[PDB]
Amino acid sequence: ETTDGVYRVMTRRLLGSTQVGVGVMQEGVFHTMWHVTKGAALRSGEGRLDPYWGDVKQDLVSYCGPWKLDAAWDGLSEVQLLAVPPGERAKNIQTLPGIFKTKDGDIGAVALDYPAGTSGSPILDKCGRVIGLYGNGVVIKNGSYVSAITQGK
């Protein structure tokens, strides 16, 4: 299935069928985070998806083609995390992102804590454009999880 939208990344190698992450299908390219697939190939029905580009530091990987997601957080408006937890239905969660302040610039961050099956969930702007992926971040002194809004180029 090459139908644009968000997908679950499942594996039938552990116990039963486990959900290891989430991905986005857009312009015939599947986008997810590196730590989810570790560059491994993906099966979509009878067809096979081969890795095309990846970067461990960015924790991103694309299949079937180059990174296609270009939207970025405007730094002001609220966003929606389309969280796809394993075994549960996709739910849109609205929030105002924080900021990751690094030596190479600032990156948006969302203070939403979700299970391990959720890495790769897309983060959307008001116009439905994917501005990043959820699943790579930090836990702060209180124990709350804060994920960076990881977007490619």
Partner: protein
């Protein structure tokens, strides 16, 4: 073998639950893509 299955559309829902606060953190990113607090 890993495989993918569709989960839904990428669309903004007008009446979505709003939660999560908005922290500003100083972080560092290592070569292995891991984030770390700097202060």
């Amino acid at each position: 073998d890993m495989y993918i299955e569709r989960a839904g559309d990428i669309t903004w829902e007008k009446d979505a639950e709003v939660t999560g606060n908005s922290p500003r953190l100083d972080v560092a990113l290592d070569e292995s893509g891991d984030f770390s607090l700097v202060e």
